[PDB]
């Protein structure tokens, strides 16, 4: 589950009812696939390109 490559989550991983639940830090939203974290510019934790 979360022990296997972070449950395939981009960020936070929890095991609820023996299944993976992904979540994201503030300023990100959880994608439709329930795994990717989508920035809502200058999201936390990203080096700046512009």
């Amino acid at each position: 589950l979360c022990s296997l490559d972070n449950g395939d989550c981009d960020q936070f991983c929890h095991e609820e009812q023996n299944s993976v639940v992904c979540s994201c830090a503030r300023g990100y939203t959880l994608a439709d696939n329930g795994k990717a974290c989508i920035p809502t510019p200058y999201p936390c934790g990203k080096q700046t390109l512009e």
């Binding site: 960020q11 991983c13 503030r26 200058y42 936390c44 934790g45 990203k46 080096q47 700046t48 512009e50």
Partner: protein, 234 residues
């Protein structure tokens, strides 16, 4: 930072610098949000009054991207003491909001359990700052960063002349001449996970800098996540 490399454009955007009335950097900080900076409680004794500079990479010259913010509220952990250096943590509320831009952005605050199982079990973290580039040297002009291995907890209890509490963790090298140093205190230790950087430590203290058989000592942010959250709301 002893050794390491220069932060190139945009590489260390969560770095804050606490500056004295002489506009001189004495400690670091981490950008948590537009209003809040993470630093060390012990930095608060190193200056009567101070401000926070964001967006700086070279202190010699003012390029244009830098911005200075005055401090509205200082929140120092009420259990810090110079005797132990335990609970070495503070949060600053700024009077005006940070404008995120190139070289100015926050690092992510992680969740406690995930951080401990996933970030702190990483091979390495990254520490940054404007501190000395050698033990006896002068404060650095350029912002630097250094990858520091996480260090086995028993390995670094054995190495320390002072008690390592559960609010601390060790990072760096046994004999390799790379470490954080004085002037880097208060600044970021972040851990990279899938190209996203989470704050994991606050540069705290060490015996000298880059010494053989000694490690860099950092405040364990995961021990204070609830305290940080509370400080940012109340």
């Amino acid at each position: 930072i002893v050794g390491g490399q220069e932060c190139k454009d945009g590489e260390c955007p969560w770095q804050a610098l606490l500056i004295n009335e002489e506009n001189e950097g004495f400690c670091g900080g981490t950008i948590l949000s537009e209003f809040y900076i993470l630093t060390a409680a012990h930095c608060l004794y190193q200056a009567k009054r101070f401000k926070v500079r964001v967006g700086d990479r070279n202190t010699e010259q003012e390029e244009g991207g830098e911005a200075v913010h005055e401090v509205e509220v200082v929140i120092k952990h009420n259990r810090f003491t110079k005797e132990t250096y335990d609970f070495d943590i503070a949060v600053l509320r700024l009077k005006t909001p940070i404008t995120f831009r190139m070289n100015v952005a926050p690092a992510c605050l992680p969740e406690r359990d995930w951080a401990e199982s996933t970030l702190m079990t990483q091979k390495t973290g990254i520490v940054s700052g404007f501190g000395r580039t050698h033990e006896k040297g002068r404060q650095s002009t350029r912002l630097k960063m250094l990858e520091v291995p996480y260090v086995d907890r028993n390995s670094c209890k054995l190495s320390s002349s002072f008690i390592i509490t559960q609010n601390m963790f060790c990072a760096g090298y046994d004999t390799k001449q790379e470490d954080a140093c004085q002037g880097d205190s208060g600044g970021p230790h972040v851990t990279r996970f899938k190209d996203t950087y989470f704050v994991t430590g606050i540069v705290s203290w060490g015996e000298g800098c880059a010494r053989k058989g000694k490690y860099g000592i950092y405040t364990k942010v995961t021990a204070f996540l609830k305290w940080i959250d509370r400080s940012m709301k109340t």
